[PDB]
Design goal:
Chain B: Belongs to the DNA polymerase type-B family. This is part of a larger assembly, with chains A (370 residues), B (189 residues) and C (422 residues). Chain A is 18% helix and 27% strand. Chain B is built from 7 helices and 6 strands; from the N terminus they run αββαβββααααβα. The longest helix of chain B has 20 residues. In chain B, 41% of the residues lie in helices and 8% in strands. The structure holds iron/sulfur cluster, magnesium ion (MG) and zinc ion (2 copies). The structure holds one DNA strand of 19 nucleotides.
DNA sequence: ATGGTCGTGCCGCCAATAA
């Protein structure tokens, strides 16, 4: 409906209704088998109001440019004469939601720093947590303003986790991991935002994941330690940061097709697709191993407004890019097996309200390896 | 009965931290009559002198992995065709629904059923809760004298505390997330 | 807000645990059943009736007199209990009237206990639109009201207040010329307002019950609520020990038939004939046989007319009281083994023959049969030696080395068992 | 004061054989 109002489309057509004249269809892209999606096997599954949940194959031969992944909601213009196959003629571009409107109070603030680190915080064969230790040292030396720590603090793929060779419960392992940072960052005085990850073995394996539970916090610590669920959209100094721990880049780009491969930017097009589908996880169906509860997916996994900065850790290469006027940052993991990873630090201020509309508050980003 | 309800449940397995021999926990106690001793008292290996009750951390940790495996298996969403001739197994949930439920995409006349029903998950969770619930295991005895004899010989306050720790490890998952909650609004409105 | 009496509308929206879900239903059933006993054994005006009913209401944590503020818990209890019980007693027409009569009686009791002066606000809190009259208005129309009064003796207009109602709502009164009508408004004594309140409650209760029954198939889809919707009306030789004999003296076949009748509240034709003839064999007469069958079939939510014109003829004929008047002998074990093989939906036949070992094993297990005896019985069954296996079953359940007889008839089984047991 | 074949709703009647 939002895309219909944006593009001023008169009406939609059911999938099963034949039509010689070109018509516009509304549906979701999907695959007809359990294998990898290909251009030949793309099907469109319609809405229940119009198509009563039907599915028809689509032909992309007559389409100049396209980029499709399962679970994407688009409006497809094409011809469906026999009522069993739809041939494309034009594919509508996704329309992102308008940016957040800054208030007059947000424009009176000063320079702000956001340091971002993502798990794991140890090498893949040792438990000394030395990457966590020198990360805390870097935090102390930096004296930043906000410190966003993503999971997995206790990785579900660490070989000692599944061999049950430890002498302490992961519940207690959570307490020592917390108090490590807690007494390591007291001198810095920076706010701490701990966001869980789906790889947190000790916590509830539900996407979205609830905020962590911890009671051993002093009065000073409660003013500096804040627990935020995963995923979430947090306003830091009037800037909407989209915090997510899922490797959404690997969720999407691993099962997405495109028409151009010579000169095209991949990470940018996945980021655009994420920003245009108005959800934290458009992929339907997901891969083999990740649990999502759909009941709260509709109410806790959508974009209220388009976030000004996206923080999307991934196992792929680190990158900071401006897509659709939004600065997306991918610092990756702090530790990658036996080779070190990267973290990020971002500058943010609110410029003058007047100007050429769009003005990115986060002018500067710097991803540095730990 | 409890025996028939938990027959299909997978038995909880956990290696011994000392000797490595796999143990068996199918009930709170093992044996019958006078030799009805707790399953957590001694290791299954005869030569092993280490008490599994001491290794409560490892037992709870292995329970954690087992329950995570089960819940991920449930959320996998695997569906199976009811027709013996079709036996269609798909991960994608079709939007074509019949009166009973989803309609198979391979054969046009059949109802897809979940591979792991919610009843199976709840029964497995209840079995895990019951195998470490000494409170209901002690009241099951018909004689108070035998109950006191078994309580004062092994069920020390520390032993009861460890059993309650296992029960609370189960109850953390069984407490808020559930199935026993019935919404009256959906039932009436 | 006056949580001590309430017209039941606006269904709730809270969520509860299933244990409380069953506890509320059983408590409401118990209270509503005891209302029957109180209304039958006593009369509606004695102090003992009020005392017993209010004591029981106190016992089961249910709302009563409004003088002590925050009894929110009893309010919630009653509100949930009525709606949860609406689903069960809306199926059969023999239960809807039973529900309505006793709920109206309970509302009458709750109405009689309101002290004197909180009644006015309640009438506005139930969407009734009634009114009272001041003392000067009462004195103005005193003669008119007492003249318009019913056969109520005396001219004394007592302290009982007079209520002012729209005329259309007083149809049962002004039709008989028993009230006063002025400017399209009826004036009634406080005694008669109870009748109109209950009469107006009855129609809404019946409408709600009807509208719930037709949209109740959607609720049966839930597998956790099936026991509740079907077991709220469940539960020389006499009637009150046969169940015990099912565990003690019956052979496995007839025990299986009795279990089927106890659980499913119905039986097919073969099981009916077999069990009825055996039950004649043990010694029952016609009267208690009819009692037993009708009691076991009414619990299937069928009215007695259907049973009387359907099965009574066959039951009577089984004993030889119609037709040629021929009395029959209970089935011999050979015909049970060889004649009329069972099918799907049927529970008759010999378990030692028709039941596969993959089911016969747990059939023995559920009856506390020793594993060695189980193996011996399975070996005997594999050898097609059924009677000796049944004899071995008898010995194992009777704790004797040898029975001392040759078995060819279940009635012989029962008589031999009762020879030693009694 | 044509033939036969098919289904639907009311009733009454029967099987059984140790000890
Ligand atoms: S052998 Fe005869 S008496 Fe025994 S269970 Fe079978 S039918 Fe019944
Ligand atoms: Mg019949
Ligand atoms: Zn051992
Ligand atoms: Zn099929």
């Amino acid at each position: 409906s939002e895309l219909k109002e944006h593009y001023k489309i008169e009406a939609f057509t059911p999938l099963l209704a034949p039509a010689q004249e070109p018509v516009t269809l509304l549906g979701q892209i999907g695959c007809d088998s359990n294998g990898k999606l290909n251009n030949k096997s793309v099907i469109l599954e319609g809405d229940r109001e119009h198509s009563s949940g039907a599915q028809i194959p689509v032909d992309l031969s007559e389409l100049k440019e396209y980029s499709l992944f399962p679970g994407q909601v688009v409006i497809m213009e094409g011809i469906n004469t026999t009522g069993r196959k739809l041939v494309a003629t034009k594919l509508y571009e996704g329309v992102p939601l308008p940016f957040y409107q800054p208030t007059e109070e947000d424009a009176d603030f000063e320079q702000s720093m956001v340091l971002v680190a993502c798990g794991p915080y140890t090498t893949s064969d040792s438990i000394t947590y030395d990457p966590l230790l020198d990360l805390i040292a870097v935090i102390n030396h930096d004296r930043p303003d906000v410190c966003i720590l993503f999971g997995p603090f206790l990785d579900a793929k660490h070989e000692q986790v599944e061999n049950c060779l430890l002498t302490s419960p992961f519940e207690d392992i959570f307490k020592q991991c917390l108090r490590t940072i807690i007494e390591g960052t007291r001198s810095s005085g920076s706010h701490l935002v701990f966001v869980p990850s789906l790889r947190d073995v000790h916590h509830e394996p539900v996407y979205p994941q609830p905020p962590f539970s911890y009671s051993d916090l002093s009065r000073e610590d409660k003013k500096q330690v804040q627990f935020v669920s995963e995923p979430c959209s947090l306003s830091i100094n009037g800037v909407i940061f989209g915090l997510t721990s899922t490797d959404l880049l690997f969720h999407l780009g691993a099962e997405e097709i495109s028409s151009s491969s010579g000169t095209s930017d991949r990470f940018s097009r996945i980021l655009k697709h994420i920003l245009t589908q108005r959800s934290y996880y458009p992929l339907y169906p997901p891969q083999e191993d990740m649990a999502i509860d759909y009941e709260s997916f509709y109410v806790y996994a959508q974009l209220p407004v388009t976030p000004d900065v996206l923080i999307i850790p991934s196992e792929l290469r680190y990158f900071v890019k401006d897509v659709l006027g939004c600065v997306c940052v991918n610092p990756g993991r702090l530790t990658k097996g036996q080779v070190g990873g990267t973290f990020a630090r971002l500058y943010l201020r609110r410029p003058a309200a007047d100007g050429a509309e769009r003005q990115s508050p986060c002018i500067a980003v710097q991803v540095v390896r730990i | 009965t409890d025996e028939e309800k938990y027959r299909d449940c997978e038995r909880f397995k956990c290696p011994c931290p000392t000797c490595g021999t796999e143990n068996i926990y199918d009930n709170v106690f093992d044996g019958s009559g006078t030799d009805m001793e707790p399953s957590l008292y001694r290791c299954s290996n005869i030569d092993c002198k280490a008490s599994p009750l001491t290794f409560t951390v490892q037992l709870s940790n292995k329970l954690i992995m087992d329950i995570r495996r089960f819940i991920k298996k449930y959320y996998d969403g695997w569906l199976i065709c009811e027709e013996p001739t079709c036996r269609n197994r798909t991960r994608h949930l079709p939007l074509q629904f019949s009166r009973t439920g989803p309609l198979c995409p391979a054969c046009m006349k059949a109802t897809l059923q979940p591979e792991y029903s919610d009843k199976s998950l709840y029964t497995q969770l209840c079995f895990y809760r019951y195998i470490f619930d000494a409170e209901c295991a002690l009241e099951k005895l018909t004689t108070d004298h035998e109950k006191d004899k078994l309580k004062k010989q092994f069920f020390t306050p520390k032993v009861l505390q460890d059993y309650r720790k296992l029960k609370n490890t189960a109850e953390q998952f069984l407490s808020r997330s559930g199935y026993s909650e019935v919404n009256l609004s959906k039932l009436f409105a | 807000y006056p949580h001590c009496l309430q017209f039941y509308l606006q269904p709730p929206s809270e969520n509860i645990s299933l244990i409380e879900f069953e506890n509320l239903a059983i408590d409401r059933v118990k209270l509503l059943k005891s209302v029957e006993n109180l209304g039958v054994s006593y009369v509606k005006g004695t102090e003992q009736y009020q005392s017993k009913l209010e004591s029981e209401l106190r016992k089961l944590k249910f709302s009563y007199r409004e003088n002590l503020e925050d009894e929110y818990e009893p309010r919630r209890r009653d509100h949930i209990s009525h709606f949860i019980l609406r689903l069960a007693y809306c199926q059969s027409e023999e239960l809807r009237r039973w529900f309505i009569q006793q709920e109206m009686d309970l509302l009458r009791f709750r109405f009689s206990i309101l002290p004197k002066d909180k009644i006015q606000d309640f009438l506005k809190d139930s969407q009734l639109q009634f009114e009272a009259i001041s003392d000067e208005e009462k004195t103005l129309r005193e003669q008119e009201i007492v003249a318009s009064s019913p056969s109520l003796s005396g001219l004394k207009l007592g302290f009982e207040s007079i209520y002012k109602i729209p005329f259309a709502d007083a149809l049962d009164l002004f039709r008989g010329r028993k009230v006063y009508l002025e400017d399209g408004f009826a004036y009634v004594p406080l005694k008669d307002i109870v009748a109109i309140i209950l009469n107006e409650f009855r129609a809404k209760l019946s409408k709600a019950l009807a509208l719930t029954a037709r949209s109740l198939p959607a609720v049966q889809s839930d597998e956790r609520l099936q026991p509740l919707l079907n077991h709220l009306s469940h539960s020389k030789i006499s009637l009150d020990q046969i169940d015990l004999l099912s565990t003690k003296s019956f052979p496995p076949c007839m025990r299986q038939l009795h279990k089927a009748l106890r659980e499913n509240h119905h039986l097919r034709h073969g099981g009916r004939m077999q069990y009825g003839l055996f039950l004649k064999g043990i010694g029952l007469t016609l009267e208690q046989a009819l009692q037993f069958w009708k009691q076991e079939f009414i619990k299937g939510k069928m009215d007695p007319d259907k049973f009387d014109k359907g099965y009574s003829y066959n039951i009577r004929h089984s004993f030889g009281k119609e037709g040629k008047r021929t009395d029959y002998t209970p089935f011999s074990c050979l015909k049970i083994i060889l004649s009329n093989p069972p099918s799907q939906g049927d529970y008759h036949g010999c378990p030692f023959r028709h039941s596969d070992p993959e089911l016969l094993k747990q059939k023995l297990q559920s009856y506390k049969i020793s594993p060695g005896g189980i193996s011996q019985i399975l070996d005997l069954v594999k050898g097609t030696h059924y009677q000796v296996a049944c004899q071995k079953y008898f010995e194992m359940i009777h704790n004797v080395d040898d029975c001392g007889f040759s078995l060819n008839h279940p009635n012989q089984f029962f008589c031999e068992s009762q020879r030693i047991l009694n």
